[PDB]
């Protein structure tokens, strides 16, 4: 079958400058009709594919003029002119000229927006969680920029690294940030043996880390 | 216009076989056009798995083998998938979607359906209420929050006052361990509209059947 491929892009792009991505086919997509069978899709975060070029160069209804697409018979172009938050996402070409269908490998697009230090939110467990016999607490790293940072967790001052689990958000289609939650999980018995808990953030934004904590 | 919406079991047996289906409003499948199945792997990447085309052409993935069916009913105007004998490396998000003659889908892609294979079972989660400990600099804002626990297999729709509320949100990528799924929704609001404002986030788990309202006290 026809593979494609794509190449990821080095750095996130700044907003407002032109932005081209690339798709190679081991075959070429010119069809005996003069016309070159190739799909751009935009894949936006938590979101279906959405067409944005077929035939190569033409636009998909209601796509911006901001989007073009060019190449020859096995190497094509996606163009962004403009980039926009609303961009990011992971691009996708498809061919459209043998069975079976297939998509390229898809390219990321990251915006570069300014340094932002995370809103930090610790939470104690839940009454409902502490009946059942576990405790857990959770801390969220909030609307960061860039998506680098390390969170660590103190009890009764001191450090801990058991049964911590983190979870990373896609960058924001809307203000191009980051975020984080942070989840330490302990049996009740445990969770009962201490008072204080702390939840610390080190971000590039800042020398010191942001700590955020509570007494039981 | 033209909404195309996907629909099945979450959940699949090693071996067993997988059905969805795709239900079409605001245009007829009889159509030349591609009514197409496509799926997404955990990684993202893409596959065509074939289509069904003015009620008598289908076109399959060869490596789907003699797996794969599509089928269609007219009366209900639904087109269906049957992939049979499935393994782990099924497990994927389904899309159904038109295509044209020169590769042109417009919008017209559903919003896809999770499928996993595997032999563990369902298992609804339970959900807690993430209210601040202390109180802090007011007259701003103020973020609380919903952890989803222990449920299988994914997904869980996640909406704080019943998706009225969606900016400031951020439900986190689930985690996986011993077989179990665990998930946290943060909701960001003027600090001046809590708690005097209500803020519920309400947790859907479709595999399960279950549905959880929790509303978030100060403690
Ligand atoms: C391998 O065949 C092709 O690539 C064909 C076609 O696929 P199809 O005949 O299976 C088809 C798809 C959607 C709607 C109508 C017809 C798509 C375009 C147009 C001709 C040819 N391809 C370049």
């Known amino acids: 079958d026809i593979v494609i491929t794509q190449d990821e892009l080095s750095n996130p792009v700044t907003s407002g400058e032109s932005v081209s991505i690339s798709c190679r086919s081991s075959?070429?997509?010119?069809?005996?009709?003069?016309?070159?069978?190739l799909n751009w899709f935009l894949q936006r975060p938590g979101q279906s594919p959405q067409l944005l070029i077929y035939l190569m160069s033409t636009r998909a209804s209601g796509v911006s003029d901001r989007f073009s697409g060019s190449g020859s018979g096995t190497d094509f172009t996606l163009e962004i002119s403009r980039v926009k938050a609303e961009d990011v996402g992971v691009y996708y070409c498809?061919?459209?000229?043998?069975?079976?269908?297939?998509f390229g490998s898809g390219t990321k697009l990251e915006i570069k927006r300014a340094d932002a230090a995370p809103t930090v939110s610790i939470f104690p467990p839940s009454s409902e969680q502490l009946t059942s016999g576990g405790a857990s607490v959770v801390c969220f790293l909030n609307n960061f920029y860039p998506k680098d940072i390390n969170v660590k967790w103190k009890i009764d001052g001191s450090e801990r690294q058991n049964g911590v689990l983190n979870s990373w958000t896609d960058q924001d289609s809307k203000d191009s940030t980051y975020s984080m939650s942070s989840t330490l999980t302990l049996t009740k018995d445990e969770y009962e043996r201490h008072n204080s808990y702390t939840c610390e953030a080190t971000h590039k934004t800042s020398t010191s880390p942001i700590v955020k904590s509570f007494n039981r | 216009e033209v909404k195309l919406s996907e629909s099945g079991p979450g959940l699949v047996k090693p071996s067993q076989s997988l059905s969805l289906t795709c239900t079409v409003t605001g245009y007829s499948i009889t159509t030349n056009y591609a009514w197409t199945w496509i799926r997404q792997f955990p990684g993202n990447k893409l596959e065509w798995m074939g289509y069904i085309r003015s009620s008598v052409i289908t076109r399959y993935n060869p490596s789907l083998k003699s797996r794969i069916s599509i089928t269609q009913d007219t009366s209900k105007n639904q087109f269906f998938l049957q992939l049979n004998s499935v393994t782990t490396e099924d497990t994927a998000t389904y899309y159904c979607a038109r295509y044209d003659y020169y590769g042109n889908t417009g919008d017209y892609w559903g919003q896809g359906t999770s499928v996993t294979v595997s032999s563990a079972k369902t298992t609804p989660p339970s959900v807690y209420p993430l209210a601040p400990g202390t109180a802090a600099l007011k007259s701003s804002m103020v973020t609380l929050g919903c952890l989803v626990k222990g449920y299988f297999p994914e997904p869980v729709t996640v909406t704080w006052n019943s998706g009225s509320l969606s900016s400031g949100v951020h439900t986190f990528p689930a985690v996986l361990q011993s077989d179990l799924y665990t998930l946290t929704s943060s909701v960001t609001v003027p600090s001046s509209t809590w708690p005097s404002q209500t803020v519920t986030c309400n947790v859907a788990h479709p595999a399960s059947s279950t549905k959880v309202d929790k509303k978030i006290v100060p403690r």
């Open positions: 075959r070429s997509l010119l069809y005996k009709d003069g016309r070159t069978y």
């Open positions: 498809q061919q459209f000229v043998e069975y079976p269908f297939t």
